[PDB]
Write a protein that binds this ligand. Sequence first.
Ligand SMILES: C[As](C)(=O)[O-]
Ligand SMILES: C[As](C)(=O)[O-]
Lengths: 119, 119
Amino acid sequence: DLNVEIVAVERELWSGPATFVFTRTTAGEIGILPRHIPLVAQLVDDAMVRVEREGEDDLRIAVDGGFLSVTEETVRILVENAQFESEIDADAAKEDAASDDERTAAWGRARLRALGQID
Amino acid sequence: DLNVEIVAVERELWSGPATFVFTRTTAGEIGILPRHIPLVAQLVDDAMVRVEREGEDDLRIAVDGGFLSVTEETVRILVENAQFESEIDADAAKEDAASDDERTAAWGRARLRALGQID
Ligand SMILES: C[As](C)(=O)[O-]
Ligand SMILES: C[As](C)(=O)[O-]
């Protein structure tokens, strides 16, 4: 018989200018300015990424299975899944926040952080 | 300032045995049996993929921006997005089926085909 593999291709969610980028990594919290040494990190499980940019409100992204890759000319965020503050279900985020499964609570907290609801 | 890139990594949606795989490509409709010459195709815009397998109901996937890659030992389906018959919103599929935007109608039709609702 056949082996079938159904694969979702890599895809860019958003790309834009930033003055500051803040998130929480396994080695701790980090803030990346335009002049920054190259870096590779793994975001914490309930990580939120705050993107500050000239002329716009902060962009906040709940991030699931996130990795960071600060090269010389880019801050690259590789995500298993993410949703932007615009997309989040504020009700469902608090529902998943209640630790049903621990992996469910991280995605709930990450989302509450992107709503500015939790620290 | 910084260039930020937010990237969703490639991810395997499903992988399993199959006896038959049916879908509609730009060069026409194709059915791939265990013994098959290698092939590369682009699925049509409102494509649905039918996976037949021993001991189970057919698996149907609405596919968006799909490509097919039949190698010697795998049928690999690369998708921009997809949803399985289980996940689809049957009501919203008919709502998007009404050609609001032509790209919206393809995703609506692809989904109706995975419900077995349209041919
Ligand atoms: C490594 As496989 C056969 O689960 O795509
Ligand atoms: C090629 As680009 C700067 O839009 O990731």
